[PDB]
């Protein structure tokens, strides 16, 4: 409900992604969060993208 689904993508080469939502209006910039990439088995920066 106005809250859009986005995917956070692994900054390593893997194509691993977490999925979440965003109020794309009030918080229009790209969400960037450290999370665990299970393919390299290490925590890596993840950066917002479209779904």
């Amino acid at each position: 409900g106005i809250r859009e689904k986005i995917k956070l993508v692994s900054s390593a080469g893997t194509g691993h992604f977490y999925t979440t939502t965003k109020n794309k209006r009030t918080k229009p910039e790209k969400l960037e969060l450290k999370k665990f990439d299970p393919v390299v088995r290490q925590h890596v920066i993840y950066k917002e993208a479209k779904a």
């Binding site: 689904k5 999925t19 979440t20 939502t21």
Partner: protein, 64 residues
């Protein structure tokens, strides 16, 4: 004539060693972002058909 297999059943159940049937869990097809990772984790593995349902499945897979 030969009984005809209910084919969508046969595309959803497989018979196991002691005579049961294995099947894939419901609820892991789409609308995923909202579902807890735990719930989806526990739906990945296959499961056994419950007792109440064996009559139905067996009726549908006479050649299993």
């Amino acid at each position: 004539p030969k009984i005809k297999t209910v084919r969508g059943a046969a595309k959803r159940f497989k018979k196991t060693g002691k005579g049961g049937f294995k099947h894939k869990h419901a609820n892991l097809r789409h609308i995923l972002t909202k579902k807890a990772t735990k719930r989806k984790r526990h739906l990945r593995p296959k499961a056994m058909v419950s007792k109440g349902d064996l009559g139905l499945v067996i009726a549908c897979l006479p050649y299993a």
